[PDB]
């Protein structure tokens, strides 16, 4: 219970006290108190995982496996730790051991499926979830059905040229989510899945109504906040969207999720907050500097900022000189991206077009530097006049 | 393995005493609100538009 409340410090004391007592009680019924010692040792290992003392957690799980090799849950946590270390190969091996022990275990099959989906290995992953739905005891398993629905949903994020194929995939995803919601009227993810397909179909009002109901039911699904924020951007309610992306980042991610930070940058850009957009994209680029899309968006925001400073004659010499330097940075990045940019995420012709537009603006920007120098010198003259008039009085 | 397979009865004993409240099914469920009636009505409205009615 203390663990469920996050009172890991108290939980450590209670699990240790439980083990020490079971150690004392084994003198009366060694077989039962040893069984208690197994469950309590597993709980203690989960506590060490929650405290991130993963070396002790791994050590306890391996001890349990020395004594009770059929205790499947120890294998799954070892695999989960391997997965979280990013060592998906070892993780798949730990889950396979779990399946060698209980071949129809639904969580082991699901963890392997999630490994394949995390790798975007849609074919193998789908086969792993279908293996769960083929057994009579789990033929209506909502987690597996939702996972298959998500497999279809993930195809919708790719820019698909075949509108009929896109419609067929949308209808498959929606049919699966409808069935899950028919089987389980309380299923949060079935409802969110329906909302996601409706949003992809462009029915943003209806999708908003679905996601709004899901957020009413639970505050702890990160994707529900992202989906709502996306709808706010599409409904041009940028001020609300920016707030939802920032609060989502602060509440659900212990690190900067670059996709969410990019969505925040997109909202700030449509909001016209180019300075905040620039700073947000730089924050994303600091985490993922090799991502050419972040570099492109930075170059674009720099070009827009320079364009604005150069377009408005109110801009002074310090501002215009900074804008010129930023526009040369923009031209430099677009020239590089036109050669090395990721063809699968954006069109290189776009970067080549911006590169040319930057050179075109740079020509006019040099003229504006002279204009700014003249304007600043005129202010210097006015200031000198003001000082001498103060001496006159 | 012959030494592994011999000890499955012990683990079955342990598991009979364990109780887990959050499972693969309950982790997906809302604390009390039912969405089916509301969402199917929304989908019916969308379906009517797709059929041009």
């Amino acid at each position: 219970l203390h663990f469920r409340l996050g009172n890991l410090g108290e939980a450590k004391k209670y699990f240790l006290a439980s083990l020490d007592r079971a150690k004392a009680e084994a003198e009366h019924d060694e077989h039962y108190y040893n069984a208690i010692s197994v469950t309590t040792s597993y709980n203690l290992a989960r506590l060490y995982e929650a405290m991130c003392e993963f070396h002790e957690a791994e050590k306890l799980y391996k001890n349990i496996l020395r004594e009770h090799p059929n205790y499947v849950d120890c294998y799954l946590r070892l695999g989960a730790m391997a997965r979280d270390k990013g060592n998906f190969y070892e993780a798949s091996d730990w889950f396979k051991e779990a399946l060698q022990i209980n071949q129809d275990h639904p969580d082991a099959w699901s963890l392997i499926g999630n490994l394949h989906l995390a790798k975007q290995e849609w074919g193998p992953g789908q086969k792993k979830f279908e293996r769960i739905l083929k057994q009579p005891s789990t033929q209506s398993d909502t987690y597996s059905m939702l996972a298959l629905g998500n497999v279809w949903l993930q195809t919708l994020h790719q820019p698909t040229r075949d509108r009929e194929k896109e419609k067929r995939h949308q209808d498959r995803a929606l049919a699966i989510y409808k069935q899950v919601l028919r089987n389980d009227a309380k299923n949060l993810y079935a409802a969110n899945g329906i909302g996601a397909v409706l949003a992809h179909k462009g029915y943003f009002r209806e999708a908003r109504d679905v996601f709004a109901q899901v957020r009413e039911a639970t505050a702890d699904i990160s994707d529900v906040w992202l989906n709502l924020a996306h709808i706010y951007v599409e409904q041009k309610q940028y001020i609300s969207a920016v707030q939802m992306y920032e609060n989502c980042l602060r509440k659900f991610y212990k690190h900067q999720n670059t996709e969410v930070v990019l969505y925040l940058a997109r909202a700030l850009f449509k909001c016209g907050k180019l300075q905040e957009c620039k700073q947000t994209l730089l924050k994303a680029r600091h985490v993922a500097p090799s991502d050419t899309v972040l570099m492109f968006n930075v170059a674009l925001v720099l070009q827009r900022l320079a364009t604005s400073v150069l377009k408005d004659e109110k801009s002074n010499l310090k501002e215009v000189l900074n804008a010129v330097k930023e526009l040369e940075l923009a031209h430099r990045y677009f020239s590089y991206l036109s050669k090395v940019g990721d063809k699968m995420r954006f069109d290189l012709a776009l970067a080549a077009t911006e590169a040319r537009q930057c050179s075109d603006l740079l020509s006019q920007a040099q003229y504006h530097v002279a204009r700014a120098r003249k304007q600043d010198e005129e202010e210097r003259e006015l200031r000198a006049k003001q000082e001498q008039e103060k001496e006159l009085l | 393995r012959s030494f592994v397979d011999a000890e499955v009865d012990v683990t079955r004993d342990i598991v009979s005493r364990e109780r887990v409240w959050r499972t693969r099914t309950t982790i997906l469920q809302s604390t009390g609100k039912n969405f089916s009636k509301n969402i199917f009505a929304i989908l019916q409205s969308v379906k009517a538009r797709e059929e041009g009615r």
Binding site: F3, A11, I36, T39, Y42, N43, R46, D73, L76, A80, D107, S110, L111, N114, Y143, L146, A147, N150, L153, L156, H157, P159, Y189, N192, G193, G195, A196, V197, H200, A207, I221, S222, D223, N227, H230, V233, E234, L262, Y263, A265, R266, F269, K270, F296, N297, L300, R345, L350, T353, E354 | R17, E18, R19, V20, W21, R22, T23, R24, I27, L28
Partner: peptide
């Protein structure tokens, strides 16, 4: 007419399922 170049960002409506809950076991 050349569409004004927007921020290169594909909006993805996600439905990521939660990790399987291995909560501490009650006795």
């Amino acid at each position: 007419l050349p569409e004004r170049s927007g921020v290169v960002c594909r909006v993805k409506y996600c439905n990521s399922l939660p990790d399987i809950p291995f909560d501490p076991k009650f006795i």
